[PDB]
Design a protein around this ligand. Structure first.
Ligand SMILES: *[C@H](O)[C@H](C[C@@H]1CCNC1=O)NC(=O)[C@@H]1[C@H]2CCC[C@H]2CN1C(=O)COc1ccc(Cl)cc1Cl
Ligand SMILES: *[C@H](O)[C@H](C[C@@H]1CCNC1=O)NC(=O)[C@@H]1[C@H]2CCC[C@H]2CN1C(=O)COc1ccc(Cl)cc1Cl
Lengths: 306, 306
């Protein structure tokens, strides 16, 4: 037992990370087969991030402008093209450590692992959720752009995130690996801001089920509630509405614990209206919302990845 | 910015993980050069974990009894010996992915990354601290024994933990890689229990400094306190005593923030006596104690590992 915010093993992604330098900008790239993917703002100079113009800027670039370090080994760039907000640097060597992979785009409420990198070298790994407002609460310093987020499904890496920027509240914004931003953000220096967030209701319920599985039961009650009347309380506390599909997705956790989903909702209702009264749940004094039902089932059953 | 509980990239350890099967027991082993390390209780049968006798049990074993799977490739065991509570299985192949490594033993209060494994296959990675009572609050199911904990210092893996067991409160106990248990636990089924824990004071202060660096300042005050009189409050709230060496270790974080260590202690004192009054620190409603000063400096400065 135990419940711990768990990332996927990072080895398969570590072997894809490289350093991309152009002009005075150094950031990270992702090397898969003979392409290096990286944020297009590597082409820019401090005065370019005012109102930059990437098509104009890119036509002025040459392949030799792009220095790509794979560890202590340099790669010729033999072509370059923009795809939305990422660059694709075509190189003369396919990465022999290319895992099986997919480029997927995730939904707010879904989680993934981030391999934070600097100068093409992995620094650490941690789990994040895509917030309802399309930001992530990460840990990113200068030079971390191009770090990727991912999930692993048996032997296949599903890349879902590439880091581009921090917003003024200290949250982070980026793109999918096709270069399309998550949320209404642009890779320019503007006054852009996150915008209002909500709590991921279905994930809180999943985490309450994780707590029960691990022996925290004090918040359980015999009360129940209707889906409609729970959702009236959810809206009050700036929680997302719970749908019948959410109820269905929580079925297996409901079956394992013997606690009906709507009964767990009645527990959440009481927690929202009364607080915790000095008690904790899975070592937290807050209702936690960055574990999906999948994350709970995975950890409270022990699935691996070769 | 941001502050997130971060593990080391796990790739170097993933390449060392193997499956060890003997009789009906399957667990994980660590393959370095031509030795596989694993918990000695793999040699035992359900009725052996009552009062088992590992020297007697091991002399009755044969090399061929030990099935070692390195992925989809089998390794002949060519020798075996016990070292304290671990077995060393000498195999006919050196692991070509052996990183540079050391076997170190850590102090309570120190942190490390755990690569949870099942059937020799990595499942997930997360950060743990060695509690003052020599337990760790992990996430471990059946078949996870032999998973290791580690730190990485530039290119060198310092293995510090190998998992052996869960205790009745849901915490976990194991050994260093020389097979010596952390704390007063034995690899037998007894009524053993964790025993009283305390909060790691110097780590809480480090995390308060991490909060300031990231813009949480509401808990700061102009108050100050003496080391002696802080420690009177610490004892009251079952926090560890703060030593002058702890104060020294917090120096760099004090210098970066401009908040004297003793002033931060005065802030902690107020937090302990008053609580948080509905506010949070780095997304937590509890005083967090599993980040060391090193962990804070590392993450709030961006060190990597090749
Ligand atoms: C890329 O390495 C960089 C990552 C940033 C730096 C600090 N934390 C991060 O996540 N990205 C940027 O510097 C981007 C840059 C590309 C697109 C727009 C440009 C501005 N930008 C920002 O992140 C701006 O915001 C910001 C916020 C807070 C701090 Cl302390 C620093 C910055 Cl640069
Ligand atoms: C090894 O894979 C196993 C890991 C355990 C299993 C559940 N969580 C864990 O961390 N270790 C054991 O089963 C050990 C075994 C070797 C030494 C003494 C023997 C008893 N033991 C325990 O962990 C006993 O405790 C325990 C506690 C709670 C549960 Cl749900 C299950 C167990 Cl087995």
């Amino acid at each position: 037992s135990g419940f711990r915010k768990m990332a996927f093993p990072s080895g398969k992604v570590e072997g894809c990370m490289v350093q991309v330098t152009c002009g005075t900008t150094t950031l990270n790239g992702l090397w898969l087969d003979d392409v290096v993917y990286c944020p297009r703002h590597v082409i820019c100079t401090s005065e370019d991030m005012l109102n930059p113009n990437y098509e104009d800027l890119l036509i002025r670039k040459s392949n030799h402008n792009f220095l790509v370090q794979a560890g202590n080994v340099q790669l010729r760039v033999i072509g370059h093209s923009m795809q939305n907000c990422v660059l694709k640097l075509k190189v003369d060597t396919a990465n022999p450590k290319t895992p099986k992979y997919k480029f997927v785009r995730i939904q707010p409420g879904q989680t993934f692992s981030v391999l934070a990198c600097y100068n093409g070298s992995p620094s650490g790994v941690y789990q994040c959720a895509m917030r309802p407002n399309f930001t992530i609460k990460g840990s990113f310093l200068n030079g971390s752009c191009g770090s990727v987020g991912f999930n692993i499904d048996y032997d296949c890496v599903s890349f879902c995130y590439m880091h581009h920027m921090e917003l003024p509240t200290g949250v982070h914004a980026g793109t999918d690996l096709e270069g399309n931003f998550y949320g209404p953000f642009v890779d320019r220096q503007t006054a852009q801001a996150a915008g209002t967030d909500t709590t991921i209701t279905v994930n809180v319920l999943a985490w309450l089920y994780a707590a029960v599985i691990n022996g925290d039961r004090w918040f359980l009650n015999r009360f129940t509630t209707t889906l409609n009347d729970f959702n009236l309380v959810a809206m009050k506390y700036n929680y997302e509405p719970l749908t019948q599909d959410h109820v269905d997705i929580l079925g297996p956790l409901s079956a394992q614990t013997g606690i009906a989903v709507l009964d767990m909702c009645a527990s959440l209702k009481e927690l929202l209206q009364n607080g915790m009264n000095g008690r904790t749940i899975l070592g937290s004094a807050l209702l936690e919302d960055e574990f999906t039902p999948f994350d709970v089932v995975r950890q409270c059953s022990g699935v691996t990845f070769q």
